[PDB]
Amino acid sequence: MFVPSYYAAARPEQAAELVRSNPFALVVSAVDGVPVATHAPVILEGDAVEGGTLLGHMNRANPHWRSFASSPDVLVVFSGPHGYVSPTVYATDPAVPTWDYAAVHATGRVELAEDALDVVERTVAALEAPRDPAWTPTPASREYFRALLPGVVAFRVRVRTEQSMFKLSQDLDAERYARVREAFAADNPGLADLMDRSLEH
Amino acid sequence: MFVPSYYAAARPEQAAELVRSNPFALVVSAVDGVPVATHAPVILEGDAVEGGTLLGHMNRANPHWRSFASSPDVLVVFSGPHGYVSPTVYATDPAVPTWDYAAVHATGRVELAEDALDVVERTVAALEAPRDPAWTPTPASREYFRALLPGVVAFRVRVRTEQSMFKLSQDLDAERYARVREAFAADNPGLADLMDRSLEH
Numbered sequence A, B: 001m002f003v004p005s006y007y008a009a010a011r012p013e014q015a016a017e018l019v020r021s022n023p024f025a026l027v028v029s030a031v032d033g034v035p036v037a038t039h040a041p042v043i044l045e046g047d048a049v050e051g052g053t054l055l056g057h058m059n060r061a062n063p064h065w066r067s068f069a070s071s072p073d074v075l076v077v078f079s080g081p082h083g084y085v086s087p088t089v090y091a092t093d094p095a096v097p098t099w100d101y102a103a104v105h106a107t108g109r110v111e112l113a114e115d116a117l118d119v120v121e122r123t124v125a126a127l128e129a130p131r132d133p134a135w136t137p138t139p140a141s142r143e144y145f146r147a148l149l150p151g152v153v154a155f156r157v158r159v160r161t162e163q164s165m166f167k168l169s170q171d172l173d174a175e176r177y178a179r180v181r182e183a184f185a186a187d188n189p190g191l192a193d194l195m196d197r198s199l200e201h
């Protein structure tokens, strides 16, 4: 990822806010020099992505984690709202399309997590906390968790570098910007809100 | 990515339909052994992903493409609808959450494309065609495209291996499946639609 100045994060907290809001991540590593990716829920431990620690888990029958000793460098991609910008919206002639999106790339070294149970239980707490009502695992479900544990592999990423893209049409003049925002306000309200958050002082 | 049999595509063309429906892809390669990703529009050439050819483009100022010169293997991730499955929806005890999603991973050797104009023009046509109305580039926009070309780097991926995940709760019994589908029918109609298409003969 390359981040133009106009699409940099405005506030430092924005990257961590994106990570916490979009936990279903892509875990990417080099298995024998070839990239391999797994879609998995990953949560953030700490106030900031960079220097922070990510926790996740995957299927033990998924062979991706078997590379985590040999190929410890990993990339985790967190994806926020995104949407196509059609020149139809701009209402200008000569025009070119683009795609607006927010994403955070966290690169660090991966390691296997011994306490898999803690990882998945904290993942439950994090995803249920914003829902109403929240699901609280019963004692029977916690017993079920223990029984499922041989089938999971938990892992930790110590994040060395964090890269954040907030490509939200910030470079546009007011007329073309208003039209992009209005078009997303109807189709893609989550993107519209991110646009609004990107202009804050 | 590991795809259990019950989450495999029901029909082979389902993978290509996902790629065409979700062109805003993640292009991943090994820059100095570390995974590096660029979000870019990628389109499919051919009837099938495997054996097919992907076409995409990125910012020339994005140095990622400079690793594509050694013709290294790249991964292109296409991501369809997805959504968290809370045990609240299941309404059963002992339970465990999961995340439902569809994705296609295309792995091959990347090559820089000389005909960048053709790549970006076919990308326009492909992304505009299902919109209503579709944007038809005027002659002035075509000249604008030509003028923009020094800033773009186009590339092609000859796909060697393809993996498609349609993790859409098809392993649930009938009552729990109905509740999951009904819940997404309200929150996430794109995911609901994918579930219906996965059970079609």
Ligand code: HEM
Pocket: A038, A039, A040, A041, A057, A058, A059, A060, A062, A120, A121, A123, A124, A125, A127, A144, A145, A146, A148, A149, A151, A152, B002, B084, B096, B097, B098, B099
């Ligand atoms: C809290 C939210 C959770 C989400 C969103 C989630 C999601 C997922 C996903 C996407 C996978 C596939 C990983 C892969 O492709 O390798 C997976 C695997 C797995 N997870 Fe979780 N999980 C959650 C909590 C838990 C808990 C509490 C447990 C208890 C042990 C658990 C146990 C498993 C097991 C056994 C597998 C592999 C076998 C299977 O897929 O059923 N998960 N999970």
Ligand code: HEM
Pocket: A002, A084, A096, A097, A098, A099, B038, B039, B040, B041, B057, B058, B059, B060, B062, B120, B121, B123, B124, B125, B127, B144, B145, B146, B148, B149, B150, B151, B152
């Ligand atoms: C058809 C839909 C299109 C979409 C969704 C799209 C999207 C994008 C995206 C996401 C980037 C950033 C790539 C990166 O981070 O490296 C980019 C860069 C770029 N694209 Fe496209 N593109 C489209 C068509 C075109 C066309 C027709 C041209 C004409 C030459 C073009 C020219 C460029 C240029 C010059 C850049 C450099 C960065 C910039 O100017 O923003 N694109 N495009």
